[model samples]
Target: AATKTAFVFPGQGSQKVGMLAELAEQFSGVGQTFAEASDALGFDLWHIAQSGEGLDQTENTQPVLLTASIALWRLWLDLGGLAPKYLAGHSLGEYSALVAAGSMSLADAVKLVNLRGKLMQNAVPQGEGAMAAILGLADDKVVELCQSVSALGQGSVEAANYNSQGQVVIAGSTASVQQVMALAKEQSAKAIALPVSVPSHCSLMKPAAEKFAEALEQTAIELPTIPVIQNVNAGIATDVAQLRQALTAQLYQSVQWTRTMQSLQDQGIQYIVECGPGTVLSNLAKRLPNIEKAFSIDSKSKMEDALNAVLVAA
Candidate 1:
């Protein structure tokens, strides 16, 4: 087997109606997994996901995304897929990685992330917060622009996701975030407004993190069976406490995705499988150096292709 393989999971902004329709049809486990999550949340997540009804709500989106990824993880293992050397996830996707790593139960993860989403949404009033994606600009330049806009008392905006070398997502007050996007475009960089409801991974989320820390204290977290690289630090948690702390900090800290990809490359990762519904993470992997192959499993055919390719490589 290729011991250098890694599995990554995607977070929000990847979900859409009718996702995993083919996979759910072929694999009974897919429906069973959604049913399990629905049992935990006391609502029909699968219906919402398939019908696009309230699926975009942050609270619903979190648990659905986590459950989808977990279903894929179960399918991969059932098909005799090789155990990856490392596991990582972006933002809420980190909860999926931890569940796959045996560090947390799917029930616990779904509940925790559900509460996390509500807290994040409540931290800032609806329509008051914003996020913008800036491409073709240096990360530092984005940071500088956000800081400058923040200093003008418009509102606090800061770089939230360092997606790649020249791509960054900034989030904060709606007005402040828009200012940065305007500045970014004036500077000749492409800036696109994001449709995210919550201003994730910024100081505005500190209140949510504080409350989440209390819930983390009550939850039981175990040492991961596989190394799970976290979003806050792009480093592996050595103990259960660190895992709890990372999840709490992740709400307010920028997602260190660029560093995460670099960490995988530095660890000699050659094959990457995005065990989720979208190719977002797989597309991100292509931007990294030394990552030879990246695959995503959103359907049965994609899963077969990835399994066959990885098996041949092994």
Candidate 2:
């Protein structure tokens, strides 16, 4: 029988100091990746990853998380695990998926994310743009609230990330986001402001997207070996040109994660493995229908459990 198809998810924000401490010791290949990351950034990334508390800083966080996800992925491969049929990531996790799919080199991916983070950070001043997470609301309802708030504010607001069932993230100007938060409560939903510095996945990121595009042009990207479910459209993409376009467009478009998961199910992906520091996507996958299993590979234990589970099921 053919191997069951699996979809990979990249985690975000939950990354922290010593996030990959045990994984590094469990796999020597993971240590090499840490060394490579340290060389790429011209700093002790391994130290930063092992004990650096400043991973919360955007510049530091982006590459650190990317390195951790990719390192764990490489370790899994070394253990004779099956490759994924499809891949997707949340926000910064997208780059991790791209690297896994062979669209970009690991070194180049680290460099691009480093630059991307800085550019995104500079796009809007600290207080100019904001993001909020709305819970217990339908996706369309969140969009409606953003639209309602935008009409009454000096800035704009829109749905940024459609996370999962009843969870959505909205981004826009601070005033507009605040208005949306107040409106969400009236709609019987809870809206809490996110700590991110910029309003991502909204029209406010157009300038950043344009700038990142220019930077992207300077880098070379290859076609992925497997289809990557994109954030812009939540559809599978294998064509090199289209994949590049989708990646570029996602910088300023809503992350249709719910649709992406649905599309993956439609494509016959039964098992979802999250290959990053957190269980965010795995948790989300469990809520979706038709998903038989969801596993998060944040450490050696999860990796071993996932491998055994797949084997037993097979």
Candidate 3:
């Protein structure tokens, strides 16, 4: 583990009720954050953030995860936490990243991600669209296979995430995704169907992306105070207009996460504090030799330890 150098945020897969409830209990700031979230969303935030039923749906998943992530970030700011050189996120987590860098207001973000969930659900018929993780396969090879399968017109499997060396996620219609999984296994790669409800980051999401654009136009997005990685291109972006554009395109585009990690490495970022519920973001850096330390701050005690570690390194 390295000292805290950069900050990364987690996405939907990271959220858990026990972790979020603990945050509310341990940090005074979380109550206020959830209050804002509840107002933005019409229901008690934590009351519905559990891991069952609607919990796995994108609409609820988006706002709840956003609130949890921002709550953690707020706790970080009030606790004498060190700052980072850059910021990044996975999928819906981008909204949280923008909030951290001062591009998106917390209230607006709460509403936006929730709306994003609704639109995403409406994009594809329920259970028609699907996503899966392909491990032990090269990025180029994954791209090649997905392209070939889609050309057969079975469905629309596309490379959705370039997560790590052996980790690439794909999304599309059920048949095409299943076909791709079969082929990936034949290639001696590991394929697993994710428990995600929405088929994100694939051409199937174009409808949702278009609607999301108008929704953002209705909201306010300010320029970021610092650079944050844009998922569509894996480039650091701060311009408000361009950032919004990238986000809109993000639904139907691949998340160039591996390239974003490469950019952080290029900048010599070693320590990363995961300002969210899980260790997934921090663990991503464990694959990089340049990383000195990474921390996931979900508990009051862990937050103090992370702060102490960063302060000592500084």
Candidate 4:
């Protein structure tokens, strides 16, 4: 039987302080990856992740998480891990997936994400944007509510992330987001505010998307060796231009993560490993009944266990 493994990566919210500390202590590859990123970005990313300073800033957060994910990916390869059948990432994680799949060089990805983060941060003013997740709500209902709220002309709100069944993240102007949150609670849905200043994945990010596209046009990229199910359309891009377009549009569009997972399931993927420093994506995979096993490799013990399982199954 095929291994049918698919590796997924987490995005912004997955980052936290002191992440990858234990892994870096145990694996020299972790430091090496960070070193490469530091060289590319002209700053020590690993120190920022460990010291809990400026890691929350989007400009620093994007590259740090990308380097961490790629560190684990490199370690997995060094440990004789099998090549996964597919790769997917949520939001910023998509760049990590693309780098691992050989679509872009690590140095280039590092610099690009740094720029991408800065552009996204500059897209909206502070305290004017917000994000909230509505739990136990139907996706269509959430969309309808967002549409209703936006149509009211108080502000613009839209579904940002289709995280999983019954869970949708909404982003927009702070007032519009608050209005939607109240509406969702009125409908008996749990509304939780996200700890983010930049309201990503909405029309509010179009200016950032436009500016970022110029940088993308100058950056060289190619199709992946392993299929990458992008978050924009939940489908594989057929050409380099399609890849670029998907990435650009992804900034100002909802993340179709639920559909991305469905695409992996459709491809007969059995093992879903999160190659980042958090359980965010792996935990999401557990919500799916058809996926055989979900693993997160953020630490030495977890990496060992995940490798052991994959090796035995092979």
What do the candidate models score in CA lDDT, each in turn?
0.91, 0.82, 0.84, 0.91
Q: For model 3, how does the per-residue alpha-carbon lDDT over 84-171 read when each residue is reduced to its tens digit?
A: 7788989988899999888888888988998998998898777898899999988999999999999997788899999988899999
Residue pairs clashing, model 1 = none
Please identify model 1 stretches exceeding 4 Å from their true place: none
Model 1 sits at a Cα RMSD from the real structure of 1.0
| TM-scores of all predicted structures | 0.98, 0.95, 0.95, 0.98
Candidate 2 deviant stretches above 4 angstroms = 1-3
Model 4, residue 147: C-alpha shift (Å): 0.5
Please give, for residues 147-180, the per-residue lDDT of candidate 4 as tens digits.
9999999889999999999989999999999999
lDDT of 2 by residue, 32-142 (tens): 988887788877667766777677777778888888888888887788777777778887888888898888988898888888888888888889999899999898888
Our tally of clashes for model 1 stands at: 0
Worst 10 residues of 2 by lDDT: 1-10
Q: List the residue pairs that clash in candidate 2.
A: none
What clash count does candidate 2 reach? 0
How much does candidate 1 score in TM-score? 0.98
Residue-pair clashes per candidate? 0, 0, 5, 0
